[PDB]
Amino acid sequence: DFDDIHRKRMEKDLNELQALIEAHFENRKKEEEELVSLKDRIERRRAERAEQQRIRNEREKERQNR
Amino acid sequence: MDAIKKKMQMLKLDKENALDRAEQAEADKKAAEDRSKQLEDELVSLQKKLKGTED
Amino acid sequence: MDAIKKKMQMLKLDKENALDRAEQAEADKKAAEDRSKQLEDELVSLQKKLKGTED
Fold first, then answer.
1. According to its UniProt record, which protein family does this protein belong to (chain A)?
2. DSSP E strands: which ranges in chain C?
3. Which residues contact A13 (CB under 8 A, 6 or more apart)?
4. Which one of C8, C16, C39 has the shortest CB-CB distance to B40?
5. Which of A15, A27, A41, B37 has a CA 20 to 30 Å removed from the CA of C52?
């Protein structure tokens, strides 16, 4: 007894810390930069949609104005 | 978050174990040194008794 | 961040302090124990010479 405390504690004392650091690094890398880039891309597409909407609205208002 | 708390808990388990071992060792030193000094006093009294016997 | 660094460093410092204190205490314990053994060994011979003197 009291000799399995080492073999159940020291293991996770380093392996768990290193593995969780690895998980945090990979998750941040996968998540943050890709999300910001994708949001910028969607913003550019949204601006293009806004331009198309403005053009169509203006041309239809020009024709229909009677 | 998640892993950070567990790592802190590990760092705290090390804290408790190290501190407890230090305190126990300090108590051991106190007891052992008291033993040694009492033995030395007994030796001194034996020297004095030997001196009286020599007289 | 900020809190993680300071807390982790302080806790590791606590562990190291306790460990070194324990090592110093155990070293002094071993030295006192050996000196006590010397005191016992000399005291036995002191008793023997006292007994011869008394005879």
1. Belongs to the troponin T family.
2. none
3. B10, B14
4. C39
5. B37
Documented resolution in Å: 5.2
Partner C contacted by B6 (CB < 8 A): no
Experimental determination approach used: cryo-EM
Retrieve residue C23's tokens. Answer: 């090592």
By CA distance, what is B5's nearest residue in A?
Answer: A17
Tokens of C7: 């807390």
Measure the CA–CA gap between B31 and C36, rounded to whole angstroms: 12
Separation CA A59–CA C6 (nearest Å): 64
